[PDB]
Structure formats: structure tokens, C-alpha cells
Amino acid sequence: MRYSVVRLILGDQLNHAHSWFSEHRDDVLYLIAELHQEQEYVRHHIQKQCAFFAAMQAFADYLSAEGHHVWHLDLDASAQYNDLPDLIAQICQQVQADAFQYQRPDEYRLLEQMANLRLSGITIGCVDTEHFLLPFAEIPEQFPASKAVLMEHFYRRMRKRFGYLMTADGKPEGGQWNFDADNRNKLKSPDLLQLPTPLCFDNPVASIKARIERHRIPSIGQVGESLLWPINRAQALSLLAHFCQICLPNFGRFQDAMTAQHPHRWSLYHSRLSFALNSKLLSPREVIEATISAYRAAQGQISLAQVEGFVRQILGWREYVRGMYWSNMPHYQTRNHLGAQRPLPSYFWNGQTKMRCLQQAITQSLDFGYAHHIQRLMVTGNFALLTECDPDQVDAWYLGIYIDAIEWVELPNTRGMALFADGGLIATKPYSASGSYINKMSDYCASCAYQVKLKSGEKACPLNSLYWRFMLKHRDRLANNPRIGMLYKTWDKMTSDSQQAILSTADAYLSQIESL
Ligand SMILES: Cc1cc2nc3c(=O)[nH]c(=O)nc-3n(C[C@H](O)[C@H](O)[C@H](O)COP(=O)(O)OP(=O)(O)OC[C@H]3O[C@@H](n4cnc5c(N)ncnc54)[C@H](O)[C@@H]3O)c2cc1C
Ligand SMILES: Cc1nc2c(=O)[nH]c(=O)nc-2n(C[C@H](O)[C@H](O)[C@H](O)CO)c1C
Ligand code: SF4
Ligand SMILES: [Cl-]
Ligand code: NA
Ligand code: NA
Ligand code: NA
Ligand code: NA
Ligand code: NA
Ligand code: NA
């Protein structure tokens, strides 16, 4: 018989600056819980379970130190309840609450579950997470349903609205909006010798792993005794500072680069802030502001391309995919424009493929819970696009295996940008590529069993023929765009014999897809 108000904090709601905490109330109880149900909607990476569980406990500790009343329920405690609604209802009854409040969730499934909660004698309210730049209530106007809103136009509007990288008279700093064309370098040997050591934390996780195991919770991937990912706001801020000082000067330059050689190949110059942002340990405003401040203080050593390249991903892509998700869900999750139905190959779960590119991206995903963007898009994403993998199966892999994956951001990037299964709603054109793209941006083909210079026959890079088979299959859909039509000239110039050898090689590789 003890609290008037119960307030839930979900595992991705770790915003230390939330207005709830701006006052101290002895009549308010905060609840944060490890939840079996949140392990059952997809099979998560063990490192993702460890990171969220560690971060939820660390946030509870922060709140308690600040004088808030907080109960953190680990799986041993939460297993007494049937699901999250039962946990809420029983605890509200236990403490004789008059009111229950929660922060709006960031997946459709959970927003719907909480919206349908009814508690006898208890008033329920839903508040914002106080994190994203675009207010949730503006999504319907900014993102009309089933409309292919152009990310670039939304990004320019966001640049003007928030003032980031804008001139005093309202123009983009540097004479253009988007510096992506300057951000397409491959790492050469001297660049590899200069790669910085990624900032890795030492967060022990043996007890968390043992608790997960005791509850027979399924997971994918691997972890040792220590988790390298930030699990509290101080570690996240330290990663942000590391990024600004050590990585931001080359972030754009090598944004699309991949290497099989260097020990730090899994991180390169990326920020690795996505988990910290998506769990709301950091806000996008503070990350943007920190990186712009570092740029301005570097007196030319951080070029504008680096910081615009970074800001575009947070102010532009991240806010954009959120808007498109909420405007188009739940129908969006049914879209399969290209009719893709192939099973995801088994080496997505173990890395046992002879394609060096796929082997590197899958193995790092399994071993780190993380792949950088060009791997997600142009290595595993392109492969799943060209081989027509079932989007439901692809979504389950991406949403589970990456520590930063929550559906609002996974689904538009995977089903939309990578698989083109929304017919271009999210990103306009398919991101299809042959092995020539991988060879241009990476050193993978120099350490591969296949020959990237061969399109057909024995030992040819499978991407080379799978690319043409895909583009020819969809020629009528895609030839209306004029720039891609050029690609069909490269094809139409080939002999009948060569065209046929390529399509025959593609079909053979698909029939043997488990062996690639
Ligand atoms: C198929 C596919 C699936 C993806 N699934 C996810 C996912 O589940 N969660 C996720 O956060 N990102 C996802 N991304 C986007 C992007 O690849 C990751 O944000 C990025 O790899 C995270 O690494 P980082 O923090 O080092 O990013 P950096 O390269 O340092 O980029 C800076 C920040 O920009 C943001 N960002 C970059 N690209 C995007 C994007 N396309 N959409 C949204 N935010 C972006 C993130 O906040 C990131 O921390 C996906 C991309 C693809 C192509
Ligand atoms: C692995 C995981 N575990 C939990 C948990 O046990 N409890 C919790 O409150 N949240 C967890 N999360 C985050 C949620 O599954 C879900 O993705 C977000 O709350 C959506 O906004 C995740 C991702
Ligand atoms: S040759 Fe083809 S399969 Fe091998 S690394 Fe290059 S792109 Fe990947
Ligand atoms: Cl070189
Ligand atoms: Na359940
Ligand atoms: Na306390
Ligand atoms: Na070279
Ligand atoms: Na991106
Ligand atoms: Na779903
Ligand atoms: Na685009």
C-alpha cells in the first residue's frame, strides 16, 4: 500500500535527462525489468542481451543514487509474472497505485501492447521518450502514408529547422547540401597502418550470461567474459569523445571502406554510437552538437565532408527511417515488392562461406554484434537482395544479430533500403552491385577463393552473375529510371554467348547457394 504512481522504463528508454526525473517524488515508483517476452519476439545476440541488461541495471543505479524510488527486476524476479502486462498490473495492485504511466515504445508491437493495457481503478498515461529530434506528433504531416518521401528533401528541411551546418543567411555550409561524393575512398596500405585502436570497455558479464542461461533464453552469436560496448552514460560519453578526437577527421573519407587485413577492421573510423543512441543513453542532439563543436575547434583538421557525412546519418537517415516506420506500420512489415521467398542460407548463422566479403561481415556480426553500414547494405544486404531471400527471414537475422537493432530502425533499412521490398519507398532504387563494387571499396577480393575479374564459369565471383540475373529479371521495373538504363547498355553490348554464360552461372550458384 505504498505508491500513488507507478512509472515503467523500458530497456531502450535510458534517457537520464527525461523530465520525469526533474523532480523528486516519494509517491512515484519507477520499474525497470528484464523481460522474457522481450527475448521471445526475435532471437537476440547474446551481446545485445548483455548490453541491455547491464545498461538497465546501471540506469537503475543512477536513478537510485539521484534519490528516485526504483525497482529493477531481473529475470529471476520477473519470471513470477506471465508477461509485461501482468507484471504491471500485479505491482500496481501491490503498491495500491492510482496511476500508471509509461514512455511511448519504439516498436509497433510494444506500443500496441501498452496501448491496450487496462488496469482496474488506475489511470494510464503515455508520455514521449524526449529523445528524437522530430516530435512524434509531426510524423503524419512530414510522412504521408504510402508516400515515397525523399530522404534528401527531409534532411534539408531538418538542416534548416535545427540550424546545423547552415550559414547566417540560410544556405548549406560549404556550398552544397550533401558531401557524400567526397566520402568514397578505399583504405590503401598506408591508411591501414594508421588505423586507430577502437575504444573498448571492460564490462564483466559472466553473471548476466549465467542468468540468461538459467532461464533457457535463446541467443545467437558469441561473447567472452567481458563486453566491450558502453553500458552506461559515462561510457557512452567516453565513446563519443573518442570518436570526436580520434575518428571524426576520417569518418567521411573512409565511410564506405572495408578491409579483411587489419585487426581493427571491425570498427575503422565509425563511431559505434548506435546502441548508445538507440537505448537513449545519448541523444541525437548532443551527439550532433558534440561533433560539430569538435569540427569547429579542429581548425581545418576535420573537413566539412567528415562532419556533414556524420550529421546526415543522424539528422537525416535516422530521423527519416523512424518517420517512415511509424507512418507506414503495420502494413510496411508485409511488403514484398519483388516476391522474394528464398530461405536465408545457413552460413548466415556461422560464417562458413567461401565468399570472403560475406565471411568477413557475417563473422564480425557473430563475434561483435556489429557490422558497419556498408557491410549491412552492400555485403549482406546486397547478397540477400540478389539471391531473393525471404524478407521475413532477413529481418529476423538483422533485428536479432545487431546490438543496435530495434524494429523502427532495422525494418526500413533492411526491408526497404537493402531488399527493395517496399519498391523504393525508403530509398528509391535498388542497392544492387556486382563484385566490381566490393573490389573498388575493399581488399576482400584479394583474399578470396573466387575471382572478381570473372563474370561466368568456374571460380567467378558469384556477385558478378547474380547481379546481372537480378537486374535483367527486373529490367521493366527499373529501366524507367534513366541513369540505370545506362547499365543495361553494358549488358546489351555483350554477345549472346557471354550473356548466356553469365545467366547460366547465376542459376548454378543459386542452385548451390548453400555451398558458396
Ligand atoms: C540492412 C540495414 C540494417 C540496419 N539496421 C540498423 C539497426 O537495426 N539499427 C541502427 O541503429 N541502424 C541500422 N542500420 C543503419 C546503420 O548501418 C547503423 O546505424 C550503423 O552501422 C551503426 O554503426 P555506427 O554507430 O558505427 O554508425 P556510424 O557510421 O558512426 O554513423 C553514425 C550514426 O548514424 C546513424 N545511422 C547511420 N546510418 C543510418 C541509417 N541508415 N539509419 C539510421 N541511422 C543511421 C546511427 O545513429 C549511427 O550511430 C541498418 C542499415 C542497413 C543497411
Ligand atoms: C534484449 C532486450 N531486452 C529487454 C528487456 O529485457 N526489457 C526491456 O524493457 N527492454 C528490453 N529490450 C528493449 C525492448 O525489447 C524493445 O526493443 C524496446 O523497448 C522497443 O522500444 C531489449 C532489446
Ligand atoms: S571476389 Fe566476389 S565473393 Fe570474393 S570477396 Fe570479392 S566480391 Fe566477395
Ligand atoms: Cl597501397
Ligand atoms: Na511470454
Ligand atoms: Na533508492
Ligand atoms: Na595500393
Ligand atoms: Na547510412
Ligand atoms: Na513486426
Ligand atoms: Na536516397
Keyword list:
mainly alpha, monomer, binds flavin-adenine dinucleotide, binds chloride ion, two-stranded antiparallel sheet, dna binding protein, five-stranded parallel sheet, 516 residues, binds iron/sulfur cluster, 4 domains
Describe the protein:
InterPro entries: Crypto/Photolyase_FAD-like_sf, PhrB-like, Rossmann-like_a/b/a_fold, UV-DNA_repair_photolyase. One of its GO terms (molecular function) is metal ion binding. Pfam families: DPRP. Keywords: 4Fe-4S, FAD, Flavoprotein, Iron, Iron-sulfur, Metal-binding, Nucleotide-binding. This is Cryptochrome/photolyase family protein. It is built from 23 helices and seven strands. By secondary structure, the protein is mostly helical. It has four domains: 163 residues, no CATH class; 165 residues, no CATH class; 121 residues, no CATH class; 67 residues, no CATH class. The strands form two sheets. It has a five-stranded parallel sheet with strand order 3-2-1-4-5, with helices on both faces. The longest helix is centred in the middle third of the chain and has 25 residues. It is globular. It binds flavin-adenine dinucleotide (FAD), the ligand Cc1nc2c(=O)[nH]c(=O)nc-2n(C[C@H](O)[C@H](O)[C@H](O)CO)c1C, iron/sulfur cluster, chloride ion (CL) and sodium ion (6 copies). The site of iron/sulfur cluster has 14 residues, from helix 14, helix 18 and helix 19. One sodium ion binds next to loops.
